[PDB]
Amino acid sequence: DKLKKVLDKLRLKRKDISEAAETVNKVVERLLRRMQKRESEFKGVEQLNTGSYYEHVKISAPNQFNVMFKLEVPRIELQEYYETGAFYLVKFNPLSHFLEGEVLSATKMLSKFRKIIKEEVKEIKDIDVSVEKEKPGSPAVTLLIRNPEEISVDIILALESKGSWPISTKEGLPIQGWLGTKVRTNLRREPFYLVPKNAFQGETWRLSFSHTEKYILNNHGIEKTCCESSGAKCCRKECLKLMKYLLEQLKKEFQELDAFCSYHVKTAIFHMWTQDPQDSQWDPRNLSSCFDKLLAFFLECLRTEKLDHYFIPKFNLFSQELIDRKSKEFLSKKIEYERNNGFPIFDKL
Amino acid sequence: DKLKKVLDKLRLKRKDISEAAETVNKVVERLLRRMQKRESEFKGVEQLNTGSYYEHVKISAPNQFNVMFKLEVPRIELQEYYETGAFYLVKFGNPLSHFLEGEVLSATKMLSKFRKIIKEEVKEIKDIDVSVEKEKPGSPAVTLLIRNPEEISVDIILALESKGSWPISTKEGLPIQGWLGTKVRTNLRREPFYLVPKQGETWRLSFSHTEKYILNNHGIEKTCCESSGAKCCRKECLKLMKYLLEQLKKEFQELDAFCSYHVKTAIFHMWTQDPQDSQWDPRNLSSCFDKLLAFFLECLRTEKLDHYFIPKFNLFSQELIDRKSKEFLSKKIEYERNNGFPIFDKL
DNA sequence: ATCTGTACATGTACAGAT
DNA sequence: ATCTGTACATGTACAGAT
DNA sequence: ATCTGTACATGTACAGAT
DNA sequence: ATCTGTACATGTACAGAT
Ligand SMILES: Nc1ncnc2c1ncn2[C@@H]1O[C@H](COP(=O)(O)OP(=O)(O)OP(=O)(O)O)[C@@H](O)[C@H]1O
Ligand SMILES: Nc1ncnc2c1ncn2[C@@H]1O[C@H](COP(=O)(O)OP(=O)(O)OP(=O)(O)O)[C@@H](O)[C@H]1O
Ligand SMILES: [Mg+2]
Ligand SMILES: [Mg+2]
Ligand SMILES: [Zn+2]
Ligand SMILES: [Zn+2]
């Protein structure tokens, strides 16, 4: 019971999955063909599906989809922004119209990308779909879809580089004692990605490891058979779902928590999965203890004001410059409260 | 243990590895380039290193290397040869036209041209002392005999590469689901399969690339034998068993029918029967070797050792190995087992 | 002038050597 | 314990080709 | 270059078994 | 209550064709 029943509630319905995906795939496919069918500065982008729905940890409803349109760009030089670790300027075609002083401007290229999508969305007459107003500094072009429910799709332009990952990641991805050195070496043989976030704030990109995280979510055990048809279930994803849910419920209720996001939870459980690598440490019979030790770890992160980017160890997602101490102390109070009272926020609608 | 000292004996020396590999890689590279010449039928053939040396289970000396020269052959149809599971006929200005006889790609015609080219190229090698061994009938290999002073064999194996789905005779093979798992199994079966020459148009399936992967990714835990994981004794047990057979085989001509692939197949089944890394703790080397010996003896006595990839192919069937050959090896193994392995002290 | 099969450049798991 | 040679995967440079 | 075909992973859904 | 077996559904890798 208890947490088992909560997970029963969070579980997506097969029918809703079917109806959401088919409408999502209609729009995405149409947008994707537009990007190459034309001259178009983004001819050659490929679709990369990412985030919780494609990692099978989406909760409640299939109402948010994350898609990367990635562009392979060769002979790119990276300059780390302000020792931040995650933010870079990039330098040396149709992309000529996006540079400046030899700097590929994230802002300029996102704007044309965005302009294309808006135009194509205008030609869609079979689906009720609009482009959400732009959020400054965001990497996303966000679609809002109606019909069987509200659905949002974040279309994320990404650059794809095939060289060695930037030195700031050298000490990241510390999976050696959990997924192992062969897996780590192979993952770092994959490309890395750059996403037009902006900390020259307008020209900066941010590193993305959404492809690495997806692999990890679907290949998460120390045993190769974890959660496979001839292995045993673990409760790793279910703990992620529960913690995601506690934060979503807390964020709905308290504006004091706007600065928090699900990626903070994702980052925290990557660290917990590294600290507790054995699959037996995530036995489904120990769901409550597992959820609790995740809570305690997350609270220790808040208390110490320290949650390092799992791929970029020096980039503290909980630094003062990013999240006010007051916000972190508010979230500590609310989590400790739910914890010490049987999670009442889990009962509510 | 006694067995740890045997393993020290069996361990290859780096100095020997260097000298052997340097010469082997010179000859192989030159043979691969000549294959890409002109109107050579084998142009586009690619190199695949296989077998015990590339699996790090070669014992005693680095004196036998296995290398496949693989040729992608698109658009092919296979006919299983008489329900044997492992043997096939292959059918379709193509450069393999000279090897056809009405739809059918002749194995020995292709192997013979392959061989002729190799022999010719070896004649032009004066860098080092290397000759081509007399052909063994029905063998897929062209064997090089290198004297580096020390003697080194190189089996060069012509291979057809097909990228379609594996033949149905393997549908139930590779039973690694409780051990390496379903994702690993699916991904391995997405790789190509291989046909090597074995009546004269018969080819044989090869899974040397899959076996190589398994050898180097052999644990249920991803960290098995890794620098942040725990050592197992799976490969060490393979080495000891290979050594038992090699010592016996160089002493007793009665054992000519047996080869090391029998030992490699038996321990794949053992690795399937005991998937947990803790059933191969280095502290239990003796038990682990002993249970392998016992499994092998039961295969001998019951006359049943299924091909790991082709379940219906029995490597210990009557048609391949006489019951007396099996009973002879059984006695010799049982003898070594119950007398402290005196053949391990030999030489 | 650009294109490209061939081979160099880089990085590291494995396992022998010290 | 760290150091180190071979094998091998992938990214890239460029003589020689087009 | 783009697209379908095949195979089976990952899921949800529910009845019958335990 | 949970487990197991079948049915149902989407996502994804890659072969082969055009
Ligand atoms: N600040 C960030 N830094 C790096 N990558 C991020 C960041 N925020 C999001 N991402 C990446 O983008 C993906 C999609 O983000 P999103 O906000 O939709 O979360 P999610 O993982 O899909 O979960 P959910 O949608 O269920 O809240 C994340 O899974 C992660 O890979
Ligand atoms: N009878 C066979 N059937 C199928 N594949 C075989 C057979 N014999 C050998 N092979 C394959 O060819 C490879 C090379 O064969 P080889 O006889 O050299 O043995 P090995 O595994 O390299 O060991 P060693 O050379 O130390 O005896 C094997 O590893 C196996 O994959
Ligand atoms: Mg999301
Ligand atoms: Mg060999
Ligand atoms: Zn699991
Ligand atoms: Zn091991």
Author numbering:
A (entry chain C): 148 to 239, 246 to 352, 358 to 507
B (entry chain A): 148 to 239, 245 to 350, 359 to 507
Quote from the publication.
To test functional implications, we soaked QN-mcGAScat•dsDNA with inosine triphosphate (ITP)/GTP or ATP/ITP. Moreover, the ATP/ITP-soaked structure suggested that ATP and ITP are bound at Site-1 and Site-2, respectively; the carboxyl oxygen of ITP appeared to accept a H-bond from Ser366 as seen from GTP, and ATP fails to bind stably at Site-2 in all known structures (see also below for the pppGpA-bound structure). These results support the idea that the -NH2 of GTP is disfavored at Site-1 while the -NH2 of ATP at Site-1 provides a favorable interaction for site-specific ATP/GTP binding. E, F QN-mcGAScat•dsDNA bound to ITP/GTP (E) and ATP/ITP (F).
